[PDB]
Amino acid sequence: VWAIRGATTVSDNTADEIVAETQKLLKEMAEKNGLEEDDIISIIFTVTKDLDAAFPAIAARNMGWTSTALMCMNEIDVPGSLEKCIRVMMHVNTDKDKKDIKHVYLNGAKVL
Amino acid sequence: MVWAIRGATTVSDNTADEIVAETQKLLKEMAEKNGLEEDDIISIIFTVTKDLDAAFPAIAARNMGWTSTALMCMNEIDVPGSLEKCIRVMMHVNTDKDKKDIKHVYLNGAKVL
Amino acid sequence: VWAIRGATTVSDNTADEIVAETQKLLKEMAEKNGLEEDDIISIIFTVTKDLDAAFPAIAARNMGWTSTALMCMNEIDVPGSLEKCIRVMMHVNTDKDKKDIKHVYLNGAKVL
């Protein structure tokens, strides 16, 4: 049982971009760590307050991840912080060591 | 070993009695359908939608004697037009059931989710 | 896998106060439970909405927890509750049984 972090950005506050950018992040998180849905314990999503167009969880439902516990919140509101940012915390049952976990930072979130 | 259980429910009013009682029924339901006692529960994360502020849903767990469990409460992601008056619960548990056997619980207006 | 709760308060909404008080809470959670970073699965931080000066997760980085999954949100907005409050939820891999986990309440958070 370890936890994996993801982050990415969107250009615009639209449903399709929030969903598309999230799905890409979830897809990369799974591939890089060799995961399938039944390895995954839970997925927590946050968006910054400037995003309100859609639940990022839609992306997991698109992928067919309908048996996994999901939760969507807003990121802590810190003036001056990275805008238009979606973050993921995924708890996983895995045979890998914590040192070998691969956290995914995409698009504007590469600044962390 | 470790899996997570989701619950959701709705209330009629933004009041402390409704929030706490509907959260309590949801937790009881979640524990029953998954055969859980407090010993089995790792953590409980609560969210409420923006229209609910009258109390902490975490009081429900304390009422029913879950006084040794890590709790946390946030607001749900703000998305205008989403289900209103909604309490969600994410419960991490130690269990011998398979992921596919876990029963997630949707009550009241939350059945639509 | 058990979860550990922490809470503390700050005197002011500043980056120094938020980081310093969170760092003190994390350190006391780690010592009272005999943890190194290798034992920590994830840390979730919340702040009451009157605080916005900094990410509490900076404190985890300052203690060298650079390989741990971190996430920050605001606390549920409930009028009539403790303000200037930082809360922590920590999932850990441990041999200690649930009843032997020590939860830590500091400063104005002792009220809780």
Paired sense of beta strands A85-92 and A2-9, if any: antiparallel
CB contact under 8 A, A1 and B3: no
Chains that touch B (3 or more CB pairs under 8 A): A, C
Q: In this complex, which of C44, C81, C98 lies closest to B72 when CB atoms are compared?
A: C44
Q: Which residues contact C100 (CB under 8 A, 6 or more apart)?
A: none
- Dihedral over Cα of B40, C90, C99, B25: its sign: negative
CB contact under 8 A, C71 and A103: no
**Cα–Cα distances in angstroms (integers) from residue A36 to residues A31, A60, A91, B69, in the given order:** 8, 12, 12, 30
Q: How was this structure determined?
A: X-ray
Cα C24 to Cα C3: distance, rounded to the nearest angstrom: 18
The two three-digit tokens of residue C110, written as one number:
């002792």
Chain A segment 5-34 residues within 8 A of B by beta carbon are none
For testing the chain A interface, which of B77, B78, B102 should be mutated: the one with the most A CBs within 10 Å? Answer: B77
Please return the burial class of B2, using the count of CB atoms within 10 Å of its CB with bins 0-12, 13-18 and 19+.
Answer: middle
**Cα–Cα distances in angstroms (integers) from residue B106 to residues B5, B45, B74, B110, C85, in the given order:** 11, 16, 19, 5, 32
Which amino acid would we find at residue B98? D
**Cα–Cα distances in angstroms (integers) from residue C10 to residues A79, B72, C46, in the given order:** 18, 19, 13
Cα A12 to Cα B84: distance, rounded to the nearest angstrom: 25
Beta bridge pairs of residue B41: B93
Q: How far is A51 from chain B (nearest CA, A)?
A: 9
Closest CA to B34 of B96, B89, B113: B96
Contacts of B90 in chain A (CB under 8 A): 42, 44, 69, 71
Instruction: Name all domains of chain B by residue range, CATH numbers in brackets.
Output: 2-113 (3.30.1330.40)
The helix/strand/coil state of C59 is: helix
CB contact under 8 A, A70 and B5: no
Q: Which residue has the tokens 């969210």?
A: B47
3-state helix, strand, coil in chain A (%, to 5): 30, 30, 40
Dump the DSSP string for B4-51: EEEEEEE-SSS-HHHHHHHHHHHHHHHHHHTT--GGGEEEEEEEE-TT
Cα B94 to Cα B69: distance, rounded to the nearest angstrom: 13
Closest chain C residue to the Cα of B59, Cα to Cα: C112
Q: For residues B44 and B89, is the Cβ–Cβ distance under 8 A? A: yes
Task: Answer whether B92 touches A (CB < 8 Å).
Answer: yes
For testing the chain A interface, which of B46, B47, B72, B79 should be mutated: the one with the most A CBs within 10 Å? Answer: B79
Cα B12 to Cα B107: distance, rounded to the nearest angstrom: 13
CB contact under 8 A, A89 and C71: yes
Q: For residues B7 and B26, is the Cβ–Cβ distance under 8 A? A: yes
Cα B77 to Cα B74: distance, rounded to the nearest angstrom: 9
Resolution in A: 2.2
Cα B81 to Cα A18: distance, rounded to the nearest angstrom: 16
